[PDB]
Write a protein that binds this DNA or RNA. Structure first.
Ligand SMILES: [Mg+2]
Ligand SMILES: [Mg+2]
Lengths: 158, 157
DNA sequence: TCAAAACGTCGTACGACGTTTTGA
DNA sequence: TCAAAACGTCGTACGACGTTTTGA
């Protein structure tokens, strides 16, 4: 209880410095609408101390630990139903990344309805807003891409 | 006050991620024994988020905040009489760096008596083992480096 | 058609030093 | 003579992407 809260606070502590609460637009050519909006919480560690990623998994009950080929390890929680559960446990304690969290929670809100081209569209717009709160000067794929390729598929968003 | 306990736990989580609990040999020419064992806790964030180091400072009640000329800011806690106070706060919640706290606390126990060459000498050997726990490889001054020099000052160890 | 599991890597936010200044 | 306050900067542990694979 109060014990579980101290681990969530420590974990929030850790995510705030090494975490990554994100929302990307991934192209998926088998999709009807060509795009998926991926939600994820990822925590990075050197494989030297890979043991730490299994601990977080334990504490959270969800997530995928891998070794990367460059000497790093990632622990990662992908997707709405499980990521939502993890965020509500961290949210009260997150400080630096409560915005990325709170936005992503409301992306999860709409993910069950993303077959609708305009629901998918508000989701992607929200993914951009998350990307501005991230020192990722990395993103090639934005909502504007989704929207007009949506337009090309004959769909009417706005 | 279990709220502090929540804040300390959060902090320990941060320190474990982007912190630095360390012990260093710095050459100081105006010292008799020419060497200080400097102990420190340090936390980094980009200056874009400079406010979080000031919060950290508020939680602990010790420590200096500075902007660096490079885009980053640091929160730093140097010296035994205020770094012991802080480490005993984290120590129950630290994970990744609990080893460096303990070693550094064992260093701090000796600093009061660091004029004594053998006492300095042992603090020196201790700092090197805090060095074998830091992904770092920058250090150019080793517990040896206190010894030739102590030797050459005509001291016995 | 969906979507997570698992993946590979470039760029920079950092870690970890040594250095210079203040002042007790 | 001590020693913190304050400093400057290179290397690498990370972040934040996009991509392939598995599988429902
Ligand atoms: Mg960070
Ligand atoms: Mg780290």
């Amino acid at each position: 209880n109060f014990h579980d809260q101290l681990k969530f606070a420590w974990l929030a502590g850790f995510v705030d410095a090494d975490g990554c609460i994100n929302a990307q637009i991934v192209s998926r050519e088998d999709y009807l609408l060509k795009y998926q909006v991926r939600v994820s919480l990822t925590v990075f560690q050197s494989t030297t101390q890979h043991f730490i990623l299994l601990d977080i998994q334990k504490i959270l009950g969800c997530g995928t630990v891998r070794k990367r080929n460059d000497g790093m390890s990632e622990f990662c929680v992908v997707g709405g139903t499980s990521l939502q559960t993890t965020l509500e446990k961290l949210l009260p304690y997150l400080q630096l990344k409560r915005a990325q969290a709170k936005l992503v929670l409301q992306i999860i809100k709409k993910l069950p309805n993303t077959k609708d081209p305009s629901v998918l569209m508000e989701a992607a717009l929200l993914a951009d807003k998350v990307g501005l709160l991230t020192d990722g000067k990395k993103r090639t794929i934005l909502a504007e891409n989704v929207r007009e390729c949506l337009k090309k598929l004959g769909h009417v968003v706005s």
